[PDB]
């Protein structure tokens, strides 16, 4: 289940956890959205070799379920975003937690906030393409997060 969020040239594909049963159709959805990197914010539960053969690299940035990402995760998440946009600005970055409803949309929200959107605008933009995509606790920390244009160039 994909969802393409795009703001100021940056493209995010909020997917769910791919399975070995349907990994082929997951790869085509990535290629259809020009996705080279998949950021996994849940525990690993699928084979990563097949994705690597098709050019899709997988980055593990997991954290506790239903919580807010630690700073080390936020910094690395912004770091990999700045690396991929400079490598190919037309390339989208895929992010997935178990169902693409929690930890993955929160990272996209932080990126949208770092690009100039208020947290309520970022959350609404995500929920416009992904119904029920943030819990109240993760929202309680999105409202306290302070950006500083960490994705300026």
């Amino acid at each position: 289940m994909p969802a393409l969020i795009e703001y100021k040239g940056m493209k995010f594909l909020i997917t769910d956890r791919p399975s070995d049963i349907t990994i082929n159709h997951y790869i085509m959805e990535l290629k259809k959205n020009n996705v080279n990197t998949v950021v996994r914010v849940c525990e690993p539960s699928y084979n990563t070799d097949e994705l690597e053969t098709q050019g899709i690299t997988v980055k593990d940035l997991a954290f506790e379920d239903g919580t807010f990402p630690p700073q080390q995760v936020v910094d690395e998440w912004f770091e990999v975003l700045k690396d991929k946009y400079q490598q190919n600005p037309e390339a989208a970055v895929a992010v997935h937690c178990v169902a693409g409803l929690g930890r993955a949309p929160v990272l996209v929200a932080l990126a949208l906030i770092e690009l100039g959107l208020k947290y309520e605008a970022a959350v609404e933009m995500i929920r416009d393409k992904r119904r029920g995509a943030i819990n109240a606790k993760q929202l309680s920390f999105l409202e306290k997060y302070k950006p500083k244009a960490r994705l300026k160039h």
């Binding site: 379920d65 239903g66 937690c97 169902a99 409803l101 929690g102 930890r103 819990n135």
Partner: peptide
Amino acid sequence: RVNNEGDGDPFY
């Protein structure tokens, strides 16, 4: 449906 009662990430 999105089940958002159990603590943790919302899940389908």
